[PDB]
Design a protein around this ligand. Structure first.
Ligand code: HEM
Ligand SMILES: Oc1ccc(-c2cnnn2-c2ccc(O)cc2)cc1
Length: 394
């Protein structure tokens, strides 16, 4: 006898387990057990993953319901799970989206300057360098501070919460609540602070005093700050870090991108397609009985949408394991999700990575791992897969 198949399969973000392709071929929707002991349907094909993400009856918001089968414990108040729904009901959607485009005046130039300076410092200190702690994360953090309109120097203090905030835990985390309340007070301070007049927090401070928003709660305005900072920094830092690994391990692609950098955006779209930064399937709770492939999912059940099941599905991406820059369907991956909850920071995340990669290839064209790739230490029980340190030489 064996126990019901457990998720997640592996914390390694440099390779996909052979088990995924076998699941997808034999059972593209199938029952698994999550770290909390709940059962769930794991969906691993492109077609079923898209079907679930496009059908709002598989609810993101209902995942936070008391007594529901859980992927993991809430690290936020239950209402914050419906964050985008709350933003839209407040009439704040267009304003938040407008504040987070990579196309703000001088934002891209800021990213480039920041990436270059980080790299100069690494080059000056001498190899080995940690491309995670001293490149990708400081880059993601600096970008988000500029986007929020908050002081660059406040970035490290906010960043400190993230190794706990984005944990994927069987049980509630006391530190997540301490950090959450603390970060919420920080952002409430920012809304009151007269020096903060640019970016997202600048915009939110003005809308807050605008009579058309006078019934929007102060808790929502602060929440938007914390969540958009947290989600943005964790997602871009993790993506860029694991994309640098995929790049470092393909010196041919790396030379091609070094030599023809106009290919970097197509390069990034392939790195997004193949990325394993999301550690768990995207969770949804069935609010009706709904046929998914051979399975009738029952109202009240938990479904997990496995991004790399879709993104490595050979029926949709032939030779899925190869980065190929001339695919006919390059942005059709699910790295940013799909449907109602499609990532609102997608353009920002694309530009963060394009610029970081461009700067890396220019400054460090001989970049290579300074340790055998098995020596990378993969963070466990976390909503992202990332190496604790990314040691490189050049
Ligand atoms: C390359 C970097 C990124 C990747 C790979 C990424 C991935 C995703 C994915 C796959 C979803 C769907 C979640 C779901 O459907 O359950 C998502 C949602 C979200 N993302 Fe991004 N993301 C990235 C960058 C960003 C940035 C730059 C921000 C904003 C500053 C952001 C803020 C959000 C928010 C607030 C949601 C919730 C959307 C909703 O509930 O409707 N992420 N992210
Ligand atoms: O739009 C969002 C953003 C984040 C989350 C979230 C889920 N689990 N943790 N967090 C979290 C924790 C600490 C923090 O500062 C920010 C977010 C959920 C929905």
């Amino acid at each position: 006898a064996t126990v019901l198949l457990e998720v997640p399969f592996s914390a390694r973000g440099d390779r996909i387990p052979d088990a995924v392709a076998e699941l997808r071929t034999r059972e593209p929707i199938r029952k698994v057990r999550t770290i909390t002991g709940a059962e769930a349907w794991l969906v691993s094909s492109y077609a079923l993953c898209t079907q679930v993400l496009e059908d709002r009856r598989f609810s993101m918001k209902e995942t936070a319901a008391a007594g529901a089968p859980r992927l993991n414990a809430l690290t936020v108040p239950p209402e914050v799970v419906n964050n985008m729904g709350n933003i839209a009901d407040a009439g704040l959607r267009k304003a938040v989206m407008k504040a987070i485009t990579p196309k703000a005046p001088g934002l891209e130039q800021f990213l480039r300057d920041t990436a270059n300076s980080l790299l100069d410092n690494l080059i000056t200190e001498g190899a080995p360098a940690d491309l995670r702690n001293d490149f990708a994360d400081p880059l993601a953090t600096a970008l988000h501070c500029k986007v929020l309109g908050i002081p660059q120097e406040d970035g490290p203090k906010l960043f400190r919460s993230l190794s706990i905030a984005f944990m994927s835990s069987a049980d509630p985390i006391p530190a997540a609540k301490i950090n959450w309340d603390r970060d919420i007070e920080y952002m409430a301070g920012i809304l009151e602070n007269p020096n903060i007049t640019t970016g997202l927090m600048g915009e939110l401070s003005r809308l807050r005093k605008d009579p058309a928003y006078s019934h929007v709660s102060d808790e929502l305005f602060a929440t938007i700050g914390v969540t958009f900072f947290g989600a943005g920094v964790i997602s871009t830092g993790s993506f860029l870090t694991t994309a640098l690994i995929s790049l470092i391990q393909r010196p041919q692609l790396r030379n091609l991108l070094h030599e023809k950098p106009e290919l970097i955006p197509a390069g990034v779209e392939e790195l997004l397609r193949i990325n394993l930064s999301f550690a768990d399937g995207l969770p949804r709770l069935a609010t009706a009985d709904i046929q998914v492939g051979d399975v009738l999912v029952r109202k009240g059940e938990l479904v997990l949408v496995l991004l790399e099941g879709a993104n490595f599905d050979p029926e949709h991406f032939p030779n899925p394991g190869s980065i190929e820059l001339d695919r006919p369907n390059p942005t059709s991956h699910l790295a940013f999700g799909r449907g109602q909850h499609f990532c609102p920071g997608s353009a920002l995340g694309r530009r963060h990575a394009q610029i970081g990669i461009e700067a890396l290839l220019k400054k460090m064209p001989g970049v290579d791992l300074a340790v055998p790739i098995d020596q990378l230490v993969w963070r466990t029980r976390f909503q992202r897969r990332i190496p604790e340190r990314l040691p490189v030489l050049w």
